[PDB]
UniProtKB/Swiss-Prot annotation, chains A, D:
Pfam families: DAHP_synth_1 (PF00793). It comes from Brucella melitensis biotype 1 (strain ATCC 23456 / CCUG 17765 / NCTC 10094 / 16M). It is found in: Cytoplasm. Pathway: Carbohydrate biosynthesis; 3-deoxy-D-manno-octulosonate biosynthesis; 3-deoxy-D-manno-octulosonate from D-ribulose 5-phosphate: step 2/3; Bacterial outer membrane biogenesis; lipopolysaccharide biosynthesis. The keyword Transferase applies. Keywords: Cytoplasm, Lipopolysaccharide biosynthesis, Transferase. It is an enzyme of class 2 (transferase). It comes from the Bacteria. This is 2-dehydro-3-deoxyphosphooctonate aldolase. GO terms for cellular component: cytoplasm. One of its GO terms (molecular function) is 3-deoxy-8-phosphooctulonate synthase activity.
Length: 258, 249, 249, 258
């Protein structure tokens, strides 16, 4: 019993609506860097008519919460977008909820029922990253922990499944399956390509997903991914983002008429 | 020496990962002569309206080759059928434009060589036990035999038990081998040992970029897996809209 | 610098891929104090007769640590429990001999470091998303933190959907990393999202060669997955017979 | 409705009986080479009390039938063992059946119903290699094509399943599952380790399988596997075979009492 349209600040997520973007660097760095990344993402999405949710993690985990919340607060004041971050404990959900619009359950924690309930109880939008060890239908039971806990605003993010050793595959059937559960479906293009333990296939997977039909994309991006503090091999260079997004929007226009 | 053609011309059809999508379509098995002309006429009608190339396919031999020959006289399209032995390649080659290597036989060198030596276009279905880069050495058996006209068909890869998965990365990787890549929508959804997901996989594949689509279709697929023929015009129209974008990028 | 110990001594138990098998066993969750002493007594009885080391395990904290402490006073064995946060490591360490990292947390560096810094033995369950060689970098987070006493537990790897598979090659590969390898028979048969195959997988693992077996067990597993406790003596006797051969070769 | 004991010449296959060995080089080479391999295999199995079925292929396929049948006939005359070879067409089953005791259906052909029926109709023992794309329970339907065709003497050979790309895994649960179908189960140690498109793990997998319980082993072997005409990376050096087999028999003695 999820909301099929999830509205967060100025952003609408729905399998029927134009694509929305969750984007940002993996890890929050300096305040300088945060404002540069968020400014560039806001400009390119403003021009395209794409809603933006700005993302960054503060726990490292495989800047710290206090500092990060200050930066997130100032970003929101300057740019007006909702923000997202990942949470790892019940105490972290309560601590970030005053500022952060969308709480994210990491893939490794997607089965941790008490964390799903704690996120749910904040009344924030909850994005659940589907674990690479889950099947698409398994998400019914995961998302239910949130919706049956009284929070109807859930997003389900596809991020690939384990395929042998050191390989993920993206089963495009996950998208209609999860959409059938009633929550907006988000496609994580950057983690879906990774070699557990690849950037050349981000566009490939993104094009496939948008044509199938998704509410949104989750794309990690950075100005110099090879030199980034975390997750660097996977992130799209920020200067390549406008071209990617323009392409995705062309397909989305067709996909969302059918 | 000899290398795969990135553009493969078959009769009045052009396959290339840079050209508009062409269609390989038909029933699994040839039934009757009348059934063949019906399916083919319906397929040609829809492909004529959309402006897409059609290769008509069926699996069978004497009677079948006469049916194929007559279909070609009447409709002017090329045809495709599966071959299983060296002897079969030789028998069907005077009539059939595309010889198809089934996925279970994609590593059978002697068959690959026989089909190559006929001079026909050879379509190899990628085994569900192969990785996309494994098609390099498969395609090389045809091209090193002197035949540059090869098509590589994606049809899914084994994913745990009784499950296939469509890794869309297979498409650019195989395209990189230098042959047109064909997406088999109807076998890629199979539950080994699902028709609902055929549109899903097809939309994904076309947005990634393919030379063509391979779809098994029938007027009554429950009494024949297959896309009902009455679902083809809507599906194809959607796939052509995505293709136009995919091929311009 | 610091490297994993190929022999890990825990209280009166020795773990090594060259030593006789030792047993890590107990219920999933600690129930009551009386239930704990019962399970433990039954396990110690059977391990005493067979001459095998026993580490008693349970998941929970204040009451639980008092139970563990009393079990140790009475039975003299080491104990193991799962930890989920840094704070938890610190709280359980004064009592619990082996800190266990659950499979879902095996990549959580901060937790790995916290458990390492306690000076206790750390057992890391291999994530079902990891390859066996991926345990190199996991184990290194504990050893580079100054703790050489690590156990590596095999518990299956994802195999398509809702299925795990036990790749017996994981065992020598992980042994090659230099830590004793533990086989989790009860989680390796899991259907994510099967008790019949626990003996099958255990027999295979022991013939390959493992430092130990991890088995969840209960007196009434339907009202608690788990091996019924009354099935343990027969299973263990079989596994010891294979172990003797495996360890001499 | 398979025979739970399959007797072929001097060899007994049963999940209850001491292990039997199917062994030989992948491809038949010279007559010299055939007699050397078969002699060495007969000597080492004679000493251990292990029944031997000598194997070689004549079709190449990813010496030729006429020559191979002559060699097989002379081997049988000299050594007295049953022999095995793989068949690929209905005509090949009829052509080799006069001489060959055990017809083998290759993994890639295990779903080809007409070939299963043709092998069955020869009245020879049929060994079916389980395809790497099959599940253990799928073998019920495969083996049924033989037994329902009137031939109750079938062997089911485990040879690994596809695990991501260029990797096989050996699911040891396949062994009790297939045994539950009633046919003797054979473990192919050499193909189960291979990298599709490894010898150091032949003993690992073999030890696992024998402890679980199997009727037999299928082991490809050659005097100089690195220089062999086919399948060389996978085959056990013939001089390592006695030590391997001695180890397997030690475990088998325990496994077959339980």
């Amino acid at each position: 019993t999820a909301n099929s349209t999830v509205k967060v600040g100025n952003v609408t997520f729905s399998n029927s609506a134009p694509l929305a973007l969750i984007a940002g660097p993996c890890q929050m760095e300096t305040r300088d860097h945060a404002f540069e990344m968020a400014g560039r993402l806001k400009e390119m999405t403003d021009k395209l008519g794409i809603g933006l949710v700005y993302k960054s993690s503060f726990d490292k985990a495989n800047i710290g919460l206090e500092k990060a919340l200050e930066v997130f607060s100032d970003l929101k004041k300057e740019y007006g977008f909702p923000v997202l971050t990942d949470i790892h404990t019940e105490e972290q959900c309560a601590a970030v909820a005053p500022v952060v619009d969308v709480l994210q359950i990491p893939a490794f924690l997607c089965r941790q029922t008490d964390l799903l309930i704690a996120a749910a109880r904040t009344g924030r939008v909850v994005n659940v990253k589907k674990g690479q060890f889950l099947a698409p239908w398994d998400m019914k039971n995961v998302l239910a922990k949130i919706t049956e806990s009284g929070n109807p605003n859930v997003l389900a993010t596809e991020r690939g499944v384990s395929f042998g050793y050191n390989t993920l595959v993206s089963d495009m059937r996950a998208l209609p399956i999860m959409a059938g559960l009633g929550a907006p479906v988000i496609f994580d293009a950057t983690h879906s390509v990774q070699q557990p333990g690849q950037r050349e296939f981000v566009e490939t997977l993104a094009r496939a997903a948008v044509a199938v039909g998704v509410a949104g994309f989750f794309i990690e991006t950075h100005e110099d991914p090879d030199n980034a503090p975390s997750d660097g091999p996977n992130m799209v260079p920020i200067d390549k983002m406008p071209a990617l997004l323009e392409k995705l929007m062309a397909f989305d226009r067709i996909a969302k008429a059918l």
